Design a protein around this ligand. Structure first.
Ligand SMILES: Nc1ncnc2c1ncn2[C@@H]1O[C@H](COP(=O)(O)OP(=O)(O)OP(=O)(O)O)[C@@H](O)[C@H]1O
Ligand SMILES: Nc1ncnc2c1ncn2[C@@H]1O[C@H](COP(=O)(O)OP(=O)(O)OP(=O)(O)O)[C@@H](O)[C@H]1O
Ligand SMILES: Cn1c(=O)c2c(ncn2C)n(C)c1=O
Ligand SMILES: [Zn+2]
Ligand SMILES: [Zn+2]
Lengths: 692, 242, 49
């Protein structure tokens, strides 16, 4: 592996058809026998594991002890049509057979299973790099054909990305994507977050920085879900069981949100069978039914629904809240370091977010969820000269002396084990800030309302009816349909206000002239003058005039045979056109065009995704000059998933062991410059002539 | 067939047989494809209507119950919101259908100490059910028409801007007079690529020419690299053919 | 898929499709990995005939 990591190093920076690559291709030709031995060794055992898993092998085995005779193993190897004779003999020789000649096929399958993985991956990377940098070579593709099995096995874990290196040329980087990372990236939650990020960035935004903030968030969501699923993989034992309970809630939070909705329907179905009657079973509400336990069913369901709501609140506090606090700690530390939002500038005195975030700076546990735990010590080293190191120390609560003391040898004692220590070690300031953030969150407020209505359901069960509105936030389709109205909500509210103004104008006119026509009374003894007062007359119009299909003319008395008849005709007709027809048409039209706009937005982004590469920006027209070239450049060359697996590769990799290109990328991530992303160029473009 | 047979048990079953016109003629199939396009959203919108009307039924059952007396003679009262089952049916049936809303049916709130709340209740029923929700349903229909029209223009304009097989646009092929039409139904014609197959299948394997044998072996192994993607005879020999 | 499981065992599987030798290709492809006899039982074909 070390030898190949050297050969790979030499090849770094090497252009297509370069000198060094051609020299190593000449190498591998000269060492053909030995290279073939190595590749066919790896092939032998990689195929062997699969055969050990094959059904034919497991119906060739006889001993219940899970052991196979050497002859039985041999004829299994023949019947699989897969290995040749001599290599079957070699496998038998490698068999850790007993004197009874019985092989443990699982152990023999797995002895060389882990030790050869890294060297196999490095050989795969070496062969792929030479193939891509020396494309037209009769002699290398021979080795590729012999190593097809290795390349197939290490394909899922071999990620390649193109960057803009220091030499101002696009260079390809090959690295290893671990199994856990790939499995966690394909998980349904992360995929949904991926599609939301794509939708948001394609509607608007600065691409590269937003991707990188998408990657970082995803990397924290990965941590949280591995923590949550960890359990599924005196105070001490109760603490262990508490962590298990809270992780069980977080893991299946959505099932809880789903069961809560089911319970709301069940209760509201129970709630349909009420009756109001003076005689006890004031006036009394009671269920009517033949069964008898409608009522205990309702009583059990009320408590169970309340419990589920409380459990959902806990699930939210342990699944989604940590991400929110991360996205605020992260943004503040940037605003603090790169922009100095509190050092140089000051929050705009109208933004509640900055002024609220002022509290947490002084706290010793500021970067509690964010990766950088040394943000304060960077803000100091950046702005201390300009604005005084002592002043920055006070603003960030850090103490200067102990800062350098920790740079020396630093001894700390383990605190005594006691619940009082937990209670008093709480940083009240940071917690106050954290909860201010949480109660500011929209989803948490919605879940809090859900709990509050559930509790009030015990004061009067009909409050459980409010719990039905959860369906709007539950299912996707109603959320889209209601997003139609919420899209143009501002215009809808203003349209309703305009309706009030116009109806008030008509009320003015009616109050002044046409007042004898507003007698909503049958008997002559009792007149019911509806436009005697402007308050009453405005209410009259606003209530019945708008609701009537014809307009206000339908309600008020007839104008026939009156000296204001003609004016009343104009008044009623223009009321009908300007309120019933046009204004309601405006409201409905806002809804219709909201549907159109949302549909347009989804097609908008989507067609973007299939006409240009997300990273390159180059269109599909160029990449399709080759057969299905765009698809390859999408999920082989410039794949946004691979650019995330890079980061999780770098972060994990030890700094000493970062290769030249990896170190260059890392130093840029840390200083937050995004020039390494290929913008407007690609490996095909850079070496168009040579690669041809 | 089943309805036709049951037509002999009672001839009126032959009425169902009229719905065949929907599947018979093209135009009604398009017009009904409008509704079936957004059927899921329409059903969910109707469900949302039931939920909202149920909320109003809750409120009416608790407070405004004296206003639901659909009876003329004082001897016989016809309390419509005495039970929630009856009151929900009342709203779901007449409140939704009435043009004004539930305010048109139930009795007048004038001169009552809940008058103002009844005004708010009726008006918000009118806006949130009669106006907005029906507008949503109709809007789903309208945008369904728009989407289907867009899809037909979508494909069609694709067909006249790029070659089906090559993928190359009409802009390149029209550097020559009417070049795109020739490349469409002379060079890369999808009909011709079918007549090839029926030529190969018929032709005797011994008599397959070199190129024909190469194509056939690929069809059989199911690799589609022989189709020209992103290239054409004009592109391959652009310099010499000039 | 579960419904289509029935027709595999039948001797007249490719009744309308052109390939009437599909079973004899599935055997020659997957018989080594999963046993020729097992493929014969799954496809109803008999090896000797
Ligand atoms: N740099 C890029 N990385 C990834 N996808 C890209 C890139 N540039 C363009 N695309 C487009 O993204 C589309 C795939 O997006 P999507 O997230 O659906 O992939 P997927 O793995 O199929 O996801 P899902 O499984 O959720 O459908 C491709 O059709 C491709 O055209
Ligand atoms: N490779 C291709 N083969 C056939 N048609 C293509 C191809 N590429 C693009 N087209 C487009 O297809 C259109 C013709 O399609 P259509 O099926 O209408 O032909 P047609 O023989 O006129 O059919 P019809 O008689 O039903 O109208 C042409 O205008 C052409 O632009
Ligand atoms: C530990 N760590 C980092 O050090 C880091 C990062 N992103 C950038 N850097 C530098 N992420 C997500 C991270 O978890
Ligand atoms: Zn790209
Ligand atoms: Zn063509």
């Amino acid at each position: 592996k070390d030898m190949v990591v050297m050969l790979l190093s030499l090849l770094e920076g090497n252009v297509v058809n370069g000198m060094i690559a051609r020299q190593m291709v000449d190498m591998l030709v000269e060492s053909s026998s030995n290279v073939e031995m190595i590749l066919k060794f790896f092939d032998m055992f990689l195929k062997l594991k699969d055969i050990v898993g094959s059904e034919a092998f497991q119906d060739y085995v006889t001993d219940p002890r899970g052991l196979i005779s050497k002859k039985d193993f041999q004829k299994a190897m023949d019947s699989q049509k897969q290995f040749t004779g001599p290599e079957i003999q070699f496998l038998l020789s490698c068999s850790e057979a007993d004197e009874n000649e019985m092989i443990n096929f699982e152990e023999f399958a797995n002895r060389f299973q882990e030790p050869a993985r890294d060297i196999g991956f490095n050989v795969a990377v070496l062969l792929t790099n030479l193939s891509e940098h020396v494309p037209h070579d009769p002699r290398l593709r021979n080795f590729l054909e012999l190593a097809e099995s290795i390349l197939e096995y290490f394909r899922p874990y071999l990620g390649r990305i193109e960057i803009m290196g220091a030499s101002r040329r696009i260079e390809r980087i090959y690295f290893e994507i671990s199994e856990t990372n790939r499995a966690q990236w394909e998980m349904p939650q992360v995929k949904e977050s991926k599609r939301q990020f794509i939708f948001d960035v394609v509607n608007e935004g600065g691409e590269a920085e937003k991707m990188e903030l998408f990657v970082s968030f995803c990397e924290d969501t990965i941590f949280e879900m591995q923590i949550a699923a960890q359990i599924s993989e005196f105070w001490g034992e109760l603490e262990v069981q508490r962590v298990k309970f809270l992780n069980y809630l977080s893991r299946n939070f959505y099932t809880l949100r789903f069961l809560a909705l089911f319970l709301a329907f069940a209760i509201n179905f129970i709630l349909l069978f009420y009756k109001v009657s003076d005689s006890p079973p004031m006036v009394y509400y009671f269920l009517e039914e033949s069964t008898g336990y409608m009522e205990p069913a309702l009583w059990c369901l009320s408590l169970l629904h309340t419990l589920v709501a409380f459990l959902c609140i806990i699930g939210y506090n342990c699944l989604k809240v940590p991400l929110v606090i991360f996205k605020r700690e992260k943004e503040l530390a940037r605003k603090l370091e790169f922009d100095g939002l509190y050092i140089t500038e000051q929050p705009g005195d109208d933004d509640v977010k900055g002024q609220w975030d002022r509290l947490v700076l002084n706290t010793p546990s500021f970067p509690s969820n964010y990766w950088d735990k040394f943000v304060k010590r960077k803000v100091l080293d950046k702005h201390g000269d300009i604005f005084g190191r002592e002043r920055i120390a006070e603003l960030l609560g850090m103490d200067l002396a102990s800062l350098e003391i920790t740079a020396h040898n630093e001894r700390k004692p383990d605190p005594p084990p006691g619940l009082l220590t937990w209670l008093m070690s709480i940083d009240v300031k940071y917690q106050i800030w954290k909860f201010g953030v949480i109660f500011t969150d929209n989803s948490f407020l919605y879940l809090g309302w859900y709990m509050v209505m559930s509790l009030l359901g015990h004061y009067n069960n009909f409050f459980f009816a409010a719990h039905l509105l959860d369906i709007a936030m539950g299912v996707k389709t109603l959320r889209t349909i209601l997003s139609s109205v919420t899209h143009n909500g501002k215009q809808l509210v203003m349209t309703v206000g305009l309706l009030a103004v116009v109806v008030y104008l008509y009320t003015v006119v009616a109050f002044n002239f046409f007042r004898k026509f507003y007698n909503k009374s049958e008997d002559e003894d009792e007149p019911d003058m509806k436009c005697d007062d402007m308050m009453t007359c405005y209410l009259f119009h606003m209530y019945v005039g708008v609701r009537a299909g014809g307009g206000i003319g339908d309600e008020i008395e007839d104008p026939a045979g009156d000296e204001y008849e003609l004016y009343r005709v104009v008044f009623d007709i223009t009321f009908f056109f300007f309120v019933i027809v046009i204004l309601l048409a405006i409201i409905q039209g806002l809804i219709i065009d909201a549907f159109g706009e949302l549909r347009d937005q989804q097609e908008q982004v989507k067609e973007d995704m299939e006409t240009k590469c997300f990273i390159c920006g180059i269109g599909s027209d160029y990449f399709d000059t080759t057969p299905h070239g765009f698809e390859t450049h999408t999920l082989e060359e410039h794949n946004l998933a691979n650019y995330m697996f890079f980061l999780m590769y770098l972060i994990n990799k030890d700094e000493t062991e970062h290769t030249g290109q990896e170190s260059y990328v890392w130093k840029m991530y840390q200083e937050r410059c995004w020039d390494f992303f290929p913008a407007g160029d690609c490996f095909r473009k850079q070496y168009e002539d040579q690669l041809s």
